[PDB]
Each structure stands twice: as C-alpha cells, then as structure tokens.
Ligand binder design. Structure first.
Ligand SMILES: CNC(=O)c1cc2c(N[C@H](c3ccc4c(c3)OCCO4)C(C)C)ncnc2[nH]1
Length: 164
C-alpha cells in the first residue's frame, strides 16, 4: 500500500515524506526507527515516532533496556510498532557527531535484510552527522529486501534523486 514512491533500483524506493505520517496512512509490517544504543527517543525520527505513540514506544524501550542492556552501534532489536506498524525495527547507525565509525553504517543497513518489506528513514543522516548521499549509496549497495525510504526534507530529497 505504499504510494507515490520513486523507484531508484529493483528493491529501493524513495519519497519526500515525514515517516510518521507515512506510517499512519500505510500501517506497514515494519517501520524502521533511527535509534541510539540506549533507545532514548529524544529527537529526530526517534522523538517524532515516539510522540506519535503517546510515549508508549519509550516505556516499552525502557523495559527492553532494563532487561537486555544497550544495543551495539550497527545493531538492532524488534519491538512493537504500536499505532504506526506491526513492528518497529530499532536500528543504531553510527553518530558521526560522537566519533562513531562511519564504516558501521553498512552493518546498520544489514539489519534491514531480515525483513521482507520496510518503511525507513536514511540511516545516520540528520542529527547523526553522516552525508545523506553516502547513506543512500550504502543503502542501495547493502539492502536486498524491499525498502521504502521516507525523506522529510524536500531540498535533500531533490539532491538525493538528482545525484543518484
Ligand atoms: C516531526 N517529524 C520529524 O521530525 C521527522 C524527521 C524525519 C526524517 N528526517 C531525516 C533523518 C534521517 C535520519 C535520521 C534522522 C532524520 O533523525 C536522526 C537520525 O536518523 C532527514 C531528512 C532530516 N525522515 C523522515 N521522517 C522524519 N520525521
């Protein structure tokens, strides 16, 4: 039920959209969160996704962390998608603004391959400091499953498409 996506490759599609609004209309099987190792959903996609669940995502995330400890950079966990999706795949991409190794971005994208279809943001772009053009490149070169990328910024969306 994804509509208005531009085809980039056989399995990668892209749209200028807010991933929260896209998730509510579609209610996909998997929505990807741009998470940190602590699952503290304060800003960016994480804060926007959590706010849409009335904080139910954060309460569930704190219980997960209390039992399992923090995730690894490049790692992921599957939790409830609440009112946005069946599941939320919380993926930790490297935060370049915190000195984390950009090489871990491919490892972060590999988590996508465990799911047939996903609605996702561009990993490590935004407040994480990675180059969004590099992030799209790693995505197309790593994900083999069907991924629908939601890019919030119109001017970034245009730049991404015109340079692909
Ligand atoms: C109220 N809604 C929002 O604040 C919102 C932001 C947002 C988003 N932003 C992108 C991004 C990529 C990757 C991230 C990220 C942000 O946040 C931290 C780390 O990972 C780029 C284009 C800025 N993409 C899709 N839906 C989004 N919704």
């Amino acid at each position: 039920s994804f509509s208005g996506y531009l085809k980039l490759t056989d399995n990668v599609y892209i749209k200028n959209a807010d991933i929260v609004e896209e998730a509510k209309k579609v209610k996909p099987t998997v929505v990807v969160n741009a998470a940190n190792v602590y699952l503290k959903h304060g800003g960016g996609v994480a804060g926007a996704l959590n706010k849409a669940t009335n904080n139910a995502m954060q309460v569930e995330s704190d219980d997960y962390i209390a039992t399992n400890g923090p995730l690894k950079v490049g790692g992921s966990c599957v939790l409830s998608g609440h009112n946005l999706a069946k599941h939320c795949l919380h993926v930790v991409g490297p935060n370049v603004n915190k000195g984390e190794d950009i090489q871990l971005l491919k490892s972060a994208y590999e988590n996508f391959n465990q799911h047939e279809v996903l609605l996702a943001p561009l990993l490590s772009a935004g407040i994480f400091g990675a180059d969004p053009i590099h992030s799209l490149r790693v995505c197309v070169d790593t994900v083999r499953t069907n991924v629908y990328l939601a890019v919030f910024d119109k001017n970034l969306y245009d730049k991404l498409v015109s340079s692909f």
